[PDB]
Design a protein around this motif. Sequence first.
Motif, PDB file in Angstrom:
ATOM      1  N   UNK B  25       0.854  -1.172   0.000  1.00 53.91           N
ATOM      2  CA  UNK B  25       0.000   0.000   0.000  1.00 53.91           C
ATOM      3  C   UNK B  25       0.900   1.236   0.000  1.00 53.91           C
ATOM      4  N   UNK B  26       0.533   2.267  -0.780  1.00 50.35           N
ATOM      5  CA  UNK B  26       1.282   3.528  -0.697  1.00 50.35           C
ATOM      6  C   UNK B  26       1.097   4.249   0.651  1.00 50.35           C
ATOM      7  N   UNK B  27       2.155   4.903   1.097  1.00 54.02           N
ATOM      8  CA  UNK B  27       2.144   5.533   2.397  1.00 54.02           C
ATOM      9  C   UNK B  27       1.201   6.701   2.470  1.00 54.02           C
ATOM     10  N   UNK B  28       1.038   7.431   1.365  1.00 51.78           N
ATOM     11  CA  UNK B  28       0.176   8.622   1.356  1.00 51.78           C
ATOM     12  C   UNK B  28      -1.280   8.334   0.954  1.00 51.78           C
ATOM     13  N   UNK B  29      -1.730   7.131   1.228  1.00 54.39           N
ATOM     14  CA  UNK B  29      -3.106   6.765   0.960  1.00 54.39           C
ATOM     15  C   UNK B  29      -4.099   7.566   1.769  1.00 54.39           C
ATOM     16  N   UNK B  30      -5.220   7.915   1.140  1.00 51.86           N
ATOM     17  CA  UNK B  30      -6.344   8.582   1.840  1.00 51.86           C
ATOM     18  C   UNK B  30      -7.643   7.800   1.734  1.00 51.86           C
ATOM     19  N   UNK B  31      -7.705   6.825   0.830  1.00 50.72           N
ATOM     20  CA  UNK B  31      -8.911   6.018   0.737  1.00 50.72           C
ATOM     21  C   UNK B  31      -8.835   4.962  -0.348  1.00 50.72           C
ATOM     22  N   UNK B  91      -6.306   2.551  -4.857  1.00 49.09           N
ATOM     23  CA  UNK B  91      -5.887   3.271  -3.654  1.00 49.09           C
ATOM     24  C   UNK B  91      -5.741   4.725  -4.104  1.00 49.09           C
ATOM     25  N   UNK B  92      -6.596   5.547  -3.539  1.00 51.50           N
ATOM     26  CA  UNK B  92      -6.562   7.013  -3.751  1.00 51.50           C
ATOM     27  C   UNK B  92      -5.492   7.598  -2.810  1.00 51.50           C
ATOM     28  N   UNK B  93      -4.590   8.389  -3.372  1.00 54.94           N
ATOM     29  CA  UNK B  93      -3.476   8.966  -2.643  1.00 54.94           C
ATOM     30  C   UNK B  93      -3.650  10.485  -2.482  1.00 54.94           C
ATOM     31  N   UNK B  94      -2.986  11.061  -1.480  1.00 50.34           N
ATOM     32  CA  UNK B  94      -3.145  12.489  -1.162  1.00 50.34           C
ATOM     33  C   UNK B  94      -2.713  13.408  -2.314  1.00 50.34           C
ATOM     34  N   UNK B  95      -1.863  12.919  -3.239  1.00 47.34           N
ATOM     35  CA  UNK B  95      -1.472  13.693  -4.418  1.00 47.34           C
ATOM     36  C   UNK B  95      -2.292  13.365  -5.697  1.00 47.34           C
ATOM     37  N   UNK B  96      -3.244  12.433  -5.545  1.00 45.09           N
ATOM     38  CA  UNK B  96      -4.066  11.870  -6.608  1.00 45.09           C
ATOM     39  C   UNK B  96      -3.288  11.206  -7.753  1.00 45.09           C
ATOM     40  N   UNK B  97      -2.074  10.760  -7.468  1.00 42.53           N
ATOM     41  CA  UNK B  97      -1.312   9.951  -8.382  1.00 42.53           C
ATOM     42  C   UNK B  97      -1.667   8.515  -7.946  1.00 42.53           C
ATOM     43  N   UNK B  98      -2.895   8.141  -8.267  1.00 39.48           N
ATOM     44  CA  UNK B  98      -3.502   6.960  -7.681  1.00 39.48           C
ATOM     45  C   UNK B  98      -2.939   5.679  -8.254  1.00 39.48           C
ATOM     46  N   UNK B  99      -3.073   4.619  -7.467  1.00 42.43           N
ATOM     47  CA  UNK B  99      -2.589   3.275  -7.855  1.00 42.43           C
ATOM     48  C   UNK B  99      -3.762   2.268  -7.838  1.00 42.43           C
ATOM     49  N   UNK B 100      -3.705   1.279  -8.716  1.00 43.35           N
ATOM     50  CA  UNK B 100      -4.705   0.254  -8.775  1.00 43.35           C
ATOM     51  C   UNK B 100      -4.084  -1.078  -9.082  1.00 43.35           C
ATOM     52  N   UNK B 101      -4.818  -2.110  -8.718  1.00 43.69           N
ATOM     53  CA  UNK B 101      -4.381  -3.480  -8.901  1.00 43.69           C
ATOM     54  C   UNK B 101      -5.606  -4.397  -8.916  1.00 43.69           C
ATOM     55  N   UNK B 102      -5.446  -5.515  -9.599  1.00 45.25           N
ATOM     56  CA  UNK B 102      -6.513  -6.408  -9.911  1.00 45.25           C
ATOM     57  C   UNK B 102      -6.146  -7.810  -9.408  1.00 45.25           C
TER      58      UNK B 102
END
Lengths: 108, 108
Positions: B25-31, B91-102
Amino acid sequence: AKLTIESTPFNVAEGKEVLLLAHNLPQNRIGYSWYKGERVDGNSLIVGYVIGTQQATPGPAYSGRETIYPNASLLIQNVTQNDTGFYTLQVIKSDLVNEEATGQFHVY
Amino acid sequence: AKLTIESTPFNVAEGKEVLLLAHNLPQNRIGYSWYKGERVDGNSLIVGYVIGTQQATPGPAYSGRETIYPNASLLIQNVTQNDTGFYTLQVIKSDLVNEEATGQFHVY
Ligand SMILES: [Zn+2]
Ligand SMILES: [Zn+2]
Ligand SMILES: [Zn+2]
Ligand SMILES: [Zn+2]
Ligand SMILES: [Zn+2]
Ligand SMILES: [Zn+2]
Ligand SMILES: [Zn+2]
């Protein structure tokens, strides 16, 4: 109402610019993410933007040519023939019931 | 450290449960936003979750059997044959450089 993307102009000369506009932005928006291609994909993320702080952060697909505006518009300058195709916007909402839309432009 | 999804167990008995977990999980996750299927698509959103407020909001694909947690995992109970196949986390991040996985599981 349904989020939609429109390129103006659709048909762009190589070396010039295109503006990607969003229609029907959701009221509870908190930020944006723009992607290269037809699908939300973190490796294809061009830029993320937080409305409240006005902070833009480049993603992996950033190429030094893209600028995002507070209303979600994306300027791409110095377009090349390789840029023809699809682009995808996500609007991140305060409840994370996020919306997305895809548009396209053509370079000649 | 790319985001990845795993189902435990991979093969799930109908009527039992499966946990979809996230590694790296990214550290700067918000949701988090969980989807049925192979992509981020609002029509297939199960649930959106804001970490700070712990507010979960169901989407169109919510069935009353899914729960989302602060560690990003999704627990599906009373699994049915309709549940097989792919699931996608963003995973929505605080910078909105979001990550996803399936990931996926199989019901038997
Ligand atoms: Zn709307
Ligand atoms: Zn990918
Ligand atoms: Zn030309
Ligand atoms: Zn052409
Ligand atoms: Zn030509
Ligand atoms: Zn594992
Ligand atoms: Zn990471």
